[PDB]
Nucleic acid binder design. Structure first.
Lengths: 49, 82
DNA sequence: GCATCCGTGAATCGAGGGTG
DNA sequence: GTGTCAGTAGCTGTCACGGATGC
RNA sequence: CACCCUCGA
């Protein structure tokens, strides 16, 4: 669906391609450990904030 | 044997990783000073290691016991220190 | 072997007044 | 002595430049 | 004295 919305631009396609991790529950923990480092990452502890 | 004297460490390093980075924030908001908070955290966790009658019952909230330790130490500094 | 990012620096003197 | 969730503010509205730092 | 403000050539 992301490709569906931002497909008219090559820069967004290249962003989704050059991405490191894929998955709804993966990028979420990525954000958590970069936003509040040093804490155990719970799926719901990140979904809450 | 020696594995037990190592189990003590691996028990602390396993609560640090789950509670120090959160206890820090508590003392931070209450002091507005990350340096003191840094100090208070070590003071508190040393007491924790010194008081094993609290972490043994893993099923009970340790974090909740820690917050009060710190919250008390800060005010102890906030006595007639003015 | 090379782009990124770190650290350095950025006019002179002078008056009064407040707070931590 | 302490014991159920218990969790920053603030902020990027400067810039030119050289060279160690790092991918 | 630490910062802060306002100002003068």
């Amino acid at each position: 669906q992301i490709v569906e919305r931002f497909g008219f631009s090559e820069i967004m396609r290249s962003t989704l391609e050059k991405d490191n991790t894929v998955g709804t529950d993966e990028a979420l923990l990525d954000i958590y450990r970069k936003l509040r480092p040093g804490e155990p990452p719970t799926k719901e502890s990140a979904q809450t904030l | 044997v020696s594995g037990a004297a190592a189990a003590e460490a691996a028990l602390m390093r396993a609560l640090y990783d789950e509670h120090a980075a959160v206890l820090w924030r508590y003392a931070l908001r209450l002091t507005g000073d990350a340096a003191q908070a840094e100090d208070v955290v070590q003071e508190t966790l040393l007491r924790a290691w010194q008081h094993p009658e609290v972490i043994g019952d893993t099923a009970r909230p340790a974090r909740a016991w820690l917050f009060t330790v710190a919250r008390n130490m800060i005010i102890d500094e906030r006595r007639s220190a003015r």
